[PDB]
Structures are given as structure tokens and as C-alpha cells.
């Protein structure tokens, strides 16, 4: 069985465990959304039935982007919500908390151990999209008009993104904005440059001001400039953190261990409190609540606005917030972003190891490695920060792979940092293949 940190029968008892855990937290009201996945329409029935056979009062918001289901769970009567999505699958909020780790296992263990509530629940249809759409239109303040290419990769974002962007005061060139679970074009994953090539060509050919790309369910956004430069989430956060801290002195801003060190200095320089944390949407949201942070972001493309918003990751709202800021600058999006400091960085580096060894390699490094003049963070793998650059090694959670990133202000410092990591991996196992 798959229960991280799948057919009809699986769906029913997942809905059953969720309902039970929601009720145990004193929350009978649960919202339920699905993405564009082909199995969706049918499979949410089983999820809803699981919930109803608990006594839950379900708000069925139909086919929505993931952050619209999060919105529902913030705005409707109940603080519980379930999103059917395969990035179907499940993103779960119970009594305000986005579940993770030993919480999803606490659900599965209800399945096996038969620890489940029983009752006669309720289903209610709710049309949340117009309220979500209006909520954003009312708060966003666009100045100049902008031409934007929008790539939805045939995911569920095309139900609201091109429309909302047009409504914000934009001319939209849609790309693959028809909801199609078959994903007949590139799969909707703006993290991979390959998935951005159609968008880059389209931005250039149509002389647009910006290109935007959404993932399948809309909780991630990718950004390209009017000249086709891909703007990574860490550089995007630089722009957002500047704006957010400008109205909120001392505000905490969270980012993950893969983000450029430049973001630490930048946030501090504007009077904010930078907070480096672990990877993963659940872990970020949790830290945001713990710290009262106004903004967070992750290298995978999840951006979390609490300021003027609700604090969940929302690719569509983040697009809006981006459009708001760029519309207030006379410069093209290319120059707004290029004005920020830049360093030499590598792409992510993968080393295929084995499932047996991956975590042990990292623990060996945490125990045995020597790092010279370096600040060590072991929040998530081993990250070492030097005055002139930094390096990261972590174990992939889903694949038997070590993941590395390096950044430095110079070509040489890059080498000098890369060299240290190579040596420290070799001290763990001299046979390990270090492809850098």
C-alpha cells in the first residue's frame, strides 16, 4: 500500500480514515475537490462515500485547482479538506492542519487496525470558483497592461488561471489551457526546462511581457521573462520578499535548503527575518504557522503567501502577485529580475546510489565529514555555507539518489566547494561515483 509522508476500494477506506480523524479533531465539515485526472469523477464518489459513512458533512466543490480546495477549507464552515490529485492521490487538511509523516500513517493504521467512525453523513454541492476568482480580483492592483502567455499543460489550472489573469487586466495567449487528463502535450511540470520550451518560444514569437506555466493541479508556478529566461523560485522569492517586507518590517520569510544564499542576505538587508527550513509543502506550511511567516517558497515552485492571503501554496495567486509587482515597474520582466545579484550555480546533480545506502551515506557525512570554514545545516541532508558559496547533498525521498547543488560567486570557488564535497563523499565510500 502507498501511504507517503489505489483504486475504488482504496479510495473508500481512505475517505473513511479521513472522516474519522477529522471527527476525532472535532471537525464534521470536510471540503472535497478533484483535479483533471481521468479517474477523478468516479473516484471522488468513493472518497465522499468514505466521508459520508463517517457522519461527515461534505462540501463537494467539484473539479478545482489544489489551492482552491485549500481556499474552500479556509472559507467554508469546516477547516478540513481533501484534494484528489496525482500531481489521482490525496492532499489532506484536517482541522486546519496539512497532514504529513506519522499523520498519514496514523490514517493507514486506522485502515488496517479497523479504527474508524460510522455515521450518516451529508453531501452538499458548492460552487467555490467564483468566490476564489473574486477574492483575488478584489485584492490585486495591476497598473500597466501586460501581455502574458499562460501554459496550463492541460491540467486543471485552465479552469481559472487564463480567465483570472485576463480579468486582472492582461491580454492572455493561452497554451494547452484545455483540461485534459490525457496530457496530450508536455506533462504539466514547470520544474523541468523541457516542459517550458513551448512557452519560451511562444513568449518570444508573440513578443509577450511574461510567460507563466502551471503544474497539473495549480499549486506550482514557473516563470519566464519577455526574453525567455527561466526565473527559478528562489529568484522569484527575492522579488516577493522585497515587496512583502516593504509593508511588514521584521517579517519572517521561509525558504528551503536548495535556495540561493543570496536570498538570506537580501531578506536581511530589507529588514526581514530569513528562515531556512526543510523541503516539502507540508513542512513549509507547518513552519509558517509556527513562525507567523508572511511568505515562504520552495525550489520546486510552491509559493506560500500569508500576507493578504491564507498561507497555503498557490501557483495561481502567486502568478497574480507577480503580475501585480511587474505591472508597477516600467522595466521589462527581464531587467527587473536581472538586476538581482547572480552567482554561478550548477544544475541539480544526481548520483544513483541504492535504497539500502542512501540515508546511511548522508548520516556518515553528518558524523564523519570535515568542512573547513563552513556553516553546517543538517535540517535536510547536509548543506554547507561558506562566505563565497555553498553546497548541498541530500537523499532523494522517492528514488535511490543523492541530490547535489552548488553555488558560488566565482568559477574557482565553485570548484573549491565542489572539490570539498567530492572529497567528503570519497571519505565515506571511495567507490562512490561522483560525477562532478
In the complex, the smallest distance separating the C-beta of residue 217 from Zn ion, rounded to whole angstroms, is 4
189 binds Zn ion, rule: CB under 5 A: no
Dihedral of the CA atoms 262, 266, 268, 271 (nearest 10)? Answer: -170
Nearer CB in complex with Zn ion: 219/252: 219
275: β partners: 254
Among 215, 243, 298, 313, binds Zn ion (CB under 5 A): 215
Among 21, 35, 189, 217, binds Zn ion (CB under 5 A): 217
| Cβ–Cβ under 8 Å, residues 65 and 159 | yes
243 binds Zn ion, rule: CB under 5 A: no
Question: For Zn ion, which stretch binds (CB under 5 A), given 68-76, 164-172, 210-218, 384-392?
Answer: 210-218
219 binds Zn ion, rule: CB under 5 A: yes
Nearest to 425 by CA among 362, 383, 376, 355: 362
What number of chain residues touch Zn ion (CB under 5 A)?
Answer: 4
| Cβ–Cβ under 8 Å, residues 123 and 29 | no
CB atoms within 10 A of CB 135: 16
380 binds Zn ion, rule: CB under 5 A: no
Question: For Zn ion, which stretch binds (CB under 5 A), given 71-79, 211-219, 319-327, 348-356?
Answer: 211-219
DSSP letter, residue 386: -
Nearest to 24 by CA among 91, 100, 112, 119: 119
In the complex, the smallest distance separating the C-beta of residue 66 from Zn ion, rounded to whole angstroms, is 6
Nearer CB in complex with Zn ion: 217/252: 217
Nearer CB in complex with Zn ion: 58/213: 213
List, in order, residues 6 or more apart from 114 with CB less than 8 Å away.
Answer: none
Nearer CB in complex with Zn ion: 37/358: 37
In the complex, the smallest distance separating the C-beta of residue 388 from Zn ion, rounded to whole angstroms, is 35
Instruction: Write b or e for each residue in 47-66: b if 16 or more Cβ atoms lie within 10 A of its Cβ, otherwise e.
Output: bbbbbbbbbbbbbbbbbbbb
Question: For Zn ion, which stretch binds (CB under 5 A), given 134-142, 220-228, 239-247, 255-263?
Answer: 220-228
What is the binding site for Zn ion (CB under 5 A)?
215, 217, 219-220
Amino acid at each position: 500500500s502507498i501511504f507517503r509522508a489505489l483504486t475504488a476500494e482504496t479510495a473508500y477506506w481512505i475517505g473513511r480514515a479521513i472522516g474519522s480523524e477529522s471527527l476525532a479533531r472535532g471537525e464534521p465539515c470536510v471540503a472535497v475537490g478533484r483535479d483533471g485526472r481521468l479517474s477523478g469523477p468516479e473516484l471522488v464518489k468513493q472518497l465522499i462515500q468514505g466521508l459520508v459513512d463517517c457522519g461527515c458533512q461534505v462540501s463537494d466543490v467539484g473539479m478545482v485547482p489544489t489551492p482552491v480546495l485549500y481556499y474552500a477549507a479556509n472559507v467554508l464552515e469546516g477547516k478540513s479538506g481533501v484534494m484528489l490529485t496525482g500531481c489521482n492521490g490525496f492532499k489532506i487538511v484536517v482541522a486546519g492542519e496539512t497532514l504529513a509523516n506519522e499523520q498519514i500513517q496514523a490514517l493507514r493504521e486506522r485502515i488496517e487496525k479497523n479504527d474508524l467512525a460510522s455515521g450518516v453523513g451529508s453531501v452538499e454541492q458548492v460552487d467555490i470558483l467564483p468566490r476564489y476568482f473574486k477574492q483575488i480580483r478584489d485584492d490585486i492592483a495591476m497598473a500597466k497592461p501586460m501581455k502574458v502567455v499562460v501554459d496550463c499543460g492541460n491540467g486543471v489550472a485552465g479552469v481559472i488561471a487564463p480567465q483570472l489573469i485576463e480579468a486582472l487586466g492582461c491580454s492572455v495567449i493561452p497554451l494547452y489551457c484545455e483540461v485534459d487528463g490525457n496530457f496530450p502535450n508536455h506533462h504539466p511540470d514547470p520544474g523541468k526546462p523541457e516542459n517550458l520550451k513551448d512557452l519560451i518560444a511562444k513568449v518570444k514569437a508573440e513578443n509577450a511581457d511574461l510567460g507563466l506555466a502551471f503544474d497539473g493541479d495549480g499549486d506550482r508556478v514557473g516563470v519566464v521573462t519577455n526574453t525567455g529566461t527561466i526565473i527559478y523560485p528562489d529568484r522569484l522569492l527575492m522579488l516577493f520578499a522585497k515587496d512583502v517586507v516593504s509593508r511588514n518590517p521584521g517579517a519572517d520569510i521561509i525558504f528551503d535548503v536548495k535556495c540561493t544564499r543570496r536570498l538570506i542576505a537580501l531578506i536581511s538587508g530589507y529588514g526581514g527575518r530569513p528562515v531556512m527550513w526543510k523541503t516539502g509543502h507540508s513542512l513549509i506550511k507547518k513552519k509558517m504557522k509556527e513562525t507567523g511567516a508572511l511568505l515562504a517558497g520552495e525550489m520546486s515552485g510552491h509559493v506560500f503567501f500569508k500576507e493578504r492571503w491564507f498561507g497555503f501554496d498557490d501557483g495561481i495567486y502567486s502568478a497574480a502577485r507577480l503580475l501585480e509587482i511587474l505591472s508597477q515597474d516600467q522595466r521589462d520582466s527581464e531587467h527587473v529580475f536581472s538586476a538581482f545579484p547572480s552567482d554561478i550555480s550548477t544544475p541539480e546533480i544526481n548520483i544513483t546510489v541504492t535504497e539500502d545506502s542512501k540515508f546511511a551515506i548522508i548520516e556518515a557525512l553528518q558524523r564523519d565529514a570535515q568542512w573547513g570554514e563552513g556553516n553546517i545545516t543538517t535540517l535536510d541532508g547536509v548543506r554547507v555555507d561558506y562566505p563565497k558559496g555553498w553546497g548541498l547533498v541530500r537523499a532523494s525521498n522517492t528514488t535511490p539518489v543523492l541530490v547535489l547543488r552548488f553555488e558560488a560567486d566565482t568559477e574557482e570557488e565553485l570548484e573549491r566547494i565542489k572539490t570539498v564535497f567530492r572529497n567528503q563523499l570519497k571519505a565515506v565510500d571511495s567507490s562512490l561515483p561522483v560525477p562532478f
